[PDB]
Design a protein around this motif. Structure first.
Motif, PDB file in Angstrom:
ATOM      1  N   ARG A  62      38.397  47.546  36.029  1.00 58.90           N
ATOM      2  CA  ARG A  62      37.231  47.259  35.196  1.00 58.90           C
ATOM      3  C   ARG A  62      37.430  47.802  33.785  1.00 58.90           C
ATOM      4  O   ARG A  62      37.085  47.135  32.804  1.00 58.90           O
ATOM      5  CB  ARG A  62      35.964  47.822  35.841  1.00 58.90           C
ATOM      6  N   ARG A 119      40.340  48.153  32.333  1.00 54.77           N
ATOM      7  CA  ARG A 119      41.326  47.284  31.697  1.00 54.77           C
ATOM      8  C   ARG A 119      40.730  45.955  31.256  1.00 54.77           C
ATOM      9  O   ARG A 119      41.232  45.341  30.305  1.00 54.77           O
ATOM     10  CB  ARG A 119      42.482  46.995  32.656  1.00 54.77           C
ATOM     11  N   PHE A 120      39.699  45.474  31.955  1.00 54.13           N
ATOM     12  CA  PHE A 120      39.406  44.047  32.005  1.00 54.13           C
ATOM     13  C   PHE A 120      37.932  43.770  31.735  1.00 54.13           C
ATOM     14  O   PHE A 120      37.316  42.943  32.411  1.00 54.13           O
ATOM     15  CB  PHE A 120      39.826  43.470  33.357  1.00 54.13           C
ATOM     16  N   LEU A 121      37.347  44.477  30.757  1.00 57.39           N
ATOM     17  CA  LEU A 121      36.016  44.171  30.217  1.00 57.39           C
ATOM     18  C   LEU A 121      34.907  44.318  31.248  1.00 57.39           C
ATOM     19  O   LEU A 121      33.910  43.596  31.203  1.00 57.39           O
ATOM     20  CB  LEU A 121      35.976  42.766  29.609  1.00 57.39           C
ATOM     21  N   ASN A 122      35.062  45.259  32.167  1.00 59.12           N
ATOM     22  CA  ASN A 122      34.157  45.450  33.297  1.00 59.12           C
ATOM     23  C   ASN A 122      33.972  44.184  34.143  1.00 59.12           C
ATOM     24  O   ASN A 122      32.977  44.047  34.861  1.00 59.12           O
ATOM     25  CB  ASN A 122      32.797  45.993  32.852  1.00 59.12           C
TER      26      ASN A 122
END
Ligand code: HPA
Ligand code: HPA
Ligand code: HPA
Ligand code: HPA
Ligand code: HPA
Ligand code: HPA
Lengths: 233, 233, 233, 233, 233, 233
Positions: free
Chosen positions: A117, A119-122
């Motif tokens: 999350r 890493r990846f915009l939640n």
């Protein structure tokens, strides 16, 4: 040079096997490689380079958990230019369709970590292996007669837990076992454009309550080791 | 017996120093203890028992990250009955009020991990050390002339990061440095009713971009080591 | 001048005691201070300045809950230049190790609020007090013979709740009591570089179901009040 | 009897006006009610009962923020049997379609609090007023010639904030102003089956940077007060 | 019988192709199947059964988005006993390694939906296809000469978006395209023990800004259709 | 022109009725409109324009779930300039205060979707209808003798669920029924400055376990249809 790896750029071949246990890494180096050289040993985390059937291959420990695993494979890729990473780890079975020492190929790694999350915009990052590598594991396993249990694993930040029905729920969603690094390996390799796959042999069975010993977690998985070497050839 | 620790119940004294680096654990055993005995070595993660100024004291590595750290201190407490745990680790400075090799006493450990939300009903667990232990570190440091930088640290699942302003924001909230285990140590010890504290010496400075070498992360912190031994006496 | 505080810059000394109840603030002003002056009274939220043993000291109410508390201590620090804030509040005991009218020193404040995630990039902010202030409370309490119960509190947005096992879980993680402001006080003071600490006396016991009366929540805590004044001297 | 309210069951009429400021509550009691009686004064939070045009009506302060507001309206409903609650508060305009001292009727209350996720299984609770009450406000306002600005408000845990574009985003989604209690009022009243509505007059304008004074936040809203009394008749 | 499907149990073969567009479902039924029968038409969402090269095969529309898709495949599996589901949809390319009308095989489906957190204890469910089915697609595509772009897709609740760098971030993590159902298909099939796979042809290119027409989204993907039929034979 | 709508700009009147079922849209076009014209039919999702009592009115299907609904009303507003949208859908009753075929006016739409957190900075967006439109529905219903059940609905991403007590909790917070689009309709209309309202007739009763048939979900709601037409006149 990094804080965690001793080697020099060029000491790692572009293909590397990984374990959490650096003593399993060392066991593979002694027993299965030809003229293996210890190339790194910071924090007692051993890595080796060697040859298998004439092909160059490296080995590297990554410790336990997503955070540890992420440190090493980030360095392996960005600094040492490793292009293919094949984890051969241990896991705890939550399916009655698998027994002690079955080999599980993880085509997805669920997780209770927050790392993806972050890493990846939640959002929900679906942590998956490289497809050609898993194709390669499947054909090599069949060309060798090795039965491969294929499915998702759950990469947890926890080894010890009082959960019970959470395990039923994971099994209901086709998760075969629990381990602690695959999702970090997969996500880091996606970030850094490397090819990764995780195999794991069953060292604990959460249904039957069987558990291997520390040394058995080194010695009891030679078909996993052979499969990994044969596909990196 | 556990999957990750070789020792027998009774090989650990009720007081234990911890590092992520088992070679720093080993360095303390050789140089600072009297008749230190290696009591565990699964996965190359060394632990020792010995005596300091006549007082029995144990040492144990815990690897990198909250998940690894949690495995070892859960086992140390529940299986080996360890009652006091004093981490003496490394960290990356984000404050201009601290330099390389300053010693930081962490009276709180913020985190980007999900482990404490999982432990604690998706609320905010304030991960804190034992108060008497931090009192004990403060008086021992002053009775020895050691300057102690006191404040919060940020325990991250990440070592490598492109963040920039997130570090300013952490510094704005009185976080002195970043490391990767304190919050897990604190929360596990809270769960299991042990006394824990984390000290960390500055091995990296994110402002000035200074960074120690792997061996310097073993050798450059003897006042930290002495403070820890003196307070466990 | 602010929307919520009447005083003029300079009417607050750099050290301030805080309560949620402005009538407890007023009780301290009448009974314990010398020539106390009411300096603010917007919204009936009284603050005072006075002298204790010759030393100047201010008092200020902050209302109930993190949002209210945050408004007042943000204004106290940014507008009125207050540098040290010592909350002396009430709390509901969840430990059998504490009884009615015990004094709890909160070395961490967990919370079910979203305020710290909003402040802190949706990470876990470990809301902690200033260390010197808690050292100061510990020595003053011992130099006065006051028994201080030391541990974490849980700062909730809720006073009324049907939870049951959530309280066991908080107690399992070494939380002594529940209140409603400490985490906001600590985080705001971290943001604005002030020194803060929270003491709370037990006015309700969630195990035994004892509960003090409104006026007893003013009158029953004079050792808490004396400790706070003595340490601000 | 509760920790926060002095009155006796039966001292509150089934219909109650609410403000955050107990001095605005007191101003309404003196100026607009007939033979108003102060019925509660814990923590300086005043409530009154009186008659308006022969009809019995109560007044009650609720302090600042969702947590404070929730304490009082939970007690008003569960203990004192209040059935209709009409908040008449202040708010900060984020729309150029409203000016200082406009009256806003909040048909929804967005929030940055966690309270409703805690109440509601971590889902999105749409915090809304009673429909008949808002119908009643609309007709009374038109039957009196009072222009009513109708829309959503944002109930925040924060009064002070460096946000900028977040306010544009709120305005883009038809939020007229920011305040700090409506969402808690609405959710508590939904839980406890009471009828609630929130009106708020503009005391601050975040676009033009206008701001009323503490006493003007008491005195400048008599049409709001008259509308509330007229609809409770 | 269900609210959304007209057919009788037994009207669906155990293998079914799926599209969001029921007119693409109908186009496949007319042009590619032998003696196709319309078996369901609630809400204009058409399904068919037919034969391809003598093998029985069903077709079914699932509408747009995870919620719609989940309704239909939950009913297809639990009520109609469908065992293999092969979505052949459209998607929007975010990679410069793919062009209009490329076929993408989704070996993982990331998502911005909350559905999998709701299903899966607020953890990260790695939504993945059945492995044999993806093996089957890979060999059939190579045995037919069809170039298959293999990777992750991002299943969004949104079609229209002002995001920009979020797309770069998805591409950086090896996501080839955006669509709106794969993650729901995969998770529902995991829950209900069916075999699922999603192929999607590029109908929009977010880099080059190319976009097919409504009818081209029916007609331009015959190699995708042929691949799906050939592997279900 | 859009990927999902066939019509030309100007084929939609500024006022539009919406259903999830395009066959209910078609039923309204045939039976209730004068000289209705089919203006769009991509993906079998029919829309019409016609006249009711001389007033021009459009109809449009939106499919099932927030993601589908959001696609269509985003296009209706931004491309086709629709200004008023009145959904007339179906829902599943969770209150014993409503029976099969009651009409529910949704003055708020709670949700388990992530769409509004994504829209709204991970805060709680209170998804509400336009107030004048709901006023208009209330007066038209009373001027026609139609009993209107007024309250919140829960917009879910799920139709099928094993939840039980979650439904009690929704009912406890004054939610009358469950459906799957209102919150997306409301939020999209807030974003794009259109006026929206959702009515829903009870087609399923989760307490009594009654459920209408597919065709009854078209035919059994003529008072809902008449109310919608009468208010758009
Ligand atoms: O049981 C386990 N849990 C997590 N990781 C593991 N690795 C081997 N066994 C396990
Ligand atoms: O820079 C760092 N980041 C995280 N952990 C560390 N431990 C030493 N330095 C660091
Ligand atoms: O029981 C309580 N809960 C929360 N805050 C409190 N303050 C005193 N008692 C309590
Ligand atoms: O500006 C404000 N913000 C929050 N609450 C308020 N109440 C009046 N003004 C404001
Ligand atoms: O661009 C797109 N976004 C989401 N789904 C899609 N399906 C086709 N194109 C797209
Ligand atoms: O039972 C239901 N659940 C969700 N949506 C619905 N629409 C009609 N009935 C239902």
């Amino acid at each position: 040079m990094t804080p965690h790896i001793n080697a020099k750029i060029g000491d790692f071949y572009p293909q590397c096997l990984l374990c959490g246990d650096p003593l399993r890494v060392s066991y593979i180096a002694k027993k299965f490689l030809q003229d293996a050289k210890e190339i790194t040993n910071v924090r007692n985390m051993l890595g080796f380079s060697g040859k298998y059937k004439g092909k160059g291959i490296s080995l590297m420990g990554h410790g336990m958990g997503i955070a540890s695993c992420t440190i090493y494979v980030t360095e392996l890729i960005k600094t040492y230019q490793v292009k293919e990473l094949l984890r051969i780890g241990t896991c705890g079975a939550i399916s009655p369709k698998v027994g002690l020492k079955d080999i599980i190929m993880a085509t997805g790694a669920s997780t209770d970590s927050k790392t993806n999350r972050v890493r990846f915009l939640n959002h929900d990052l679906s942590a998956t292996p490289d497809f050609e590598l898993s194709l390669r594991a499947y054909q090599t396993a069949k060309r060798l007669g090795i039965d491969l249990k294929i499915g998702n694993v759950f990469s947890s930040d926890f080894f010890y837990s009082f959960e019970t029905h959470a395990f039923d729920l994971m099994a209901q969603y086709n998760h075969l076992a629990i381990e602690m690094e695959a999702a970090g390996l997969y996500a880091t390799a996606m970030e850094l454009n490397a090819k990764a796959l995780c195999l794991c042999s069953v060292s604990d069975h959460l249904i039957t309550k069987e558990a291997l010993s520390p040394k058995e977690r080194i010695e009891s998985f030679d078909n996993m080791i052979i499969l990994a070497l044969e596909m990196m050839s």
